[PDB]
């Protein structure tokens, strides 16, 4: 009942943001609550933001 | 109440270097070095590439025949590209390559206007006797970052991620100045680690210029 098929392939790129699940391999899952500015983040005293 | 001003400049690396603010008041080098530290993480201008044009290349998610690498890690290469554009805020650069071999950024020919102050850093790698890479990199000026889903045409123009912002990592100390017969007198010591597309003198100078400038409302 069919002629001929045609499929078309979008590709999307999804960039982290607040709201999508993030865990580790040890049970610990969260939700991203704010995405923080890099100079708003802790730094040490080489002033390597976290 | 004194003034600090620029005593020392320490360009120890072609990246990163140390200033020096002497003398400071008891409490405003803390005041000060986080300031400046702020402003210059956040509202540094600088360039970086918008987007490219790779010759038989129609979206990022394909592979030349040729090049050992995806056409999205080569954008990401490209993204990873320092680059002090002089006169202008708006550049094209032309980069052609053929033959074995990796393709550095010495291989753009740049305009008179135009410094790639990273000739080795590696973009991608041809592995055919005869294959050819011709693009067209756009570097354009601006301040901090600006995503390409969020900007605002032909089916050939790829759009990259820019981030400009030259500086990487800021760092600030305060310790006891050497003053004739004084004390309680700090000196800030700004460590700051650029990707070569700035200066740390006129770094400083623009950050203390924008927070001037805020302070102005009163």
Known sequence: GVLKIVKVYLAVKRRIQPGDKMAGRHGNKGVISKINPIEDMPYDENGTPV | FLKPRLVDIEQVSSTH?????????????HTLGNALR???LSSMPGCAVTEVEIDGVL???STKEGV?????????????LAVRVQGKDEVILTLNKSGIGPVTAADITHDGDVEIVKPQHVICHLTDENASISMRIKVQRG????????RIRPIGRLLVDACYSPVERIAYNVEAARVEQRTDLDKLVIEMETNGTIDPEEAIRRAATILAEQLEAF
Request: glycine share 10%.
């Open chain 2, 38 to 40: 702020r402003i210059l």
């Open chain 2, 17 to 29: 270097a140390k200033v020096t603010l002497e003398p400071l008041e008891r409490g405003f080098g």
């Open chain 2, 68 to 80: 050992q690498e995806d056409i999205l890690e080569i954008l990401l290469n490209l993204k990873g």
């Open chain 2, 143 to 150: 301040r901090g970052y600006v995503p390409a889903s969020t």
């Open chain 2, 59 to 61: 979206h990022e998610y």
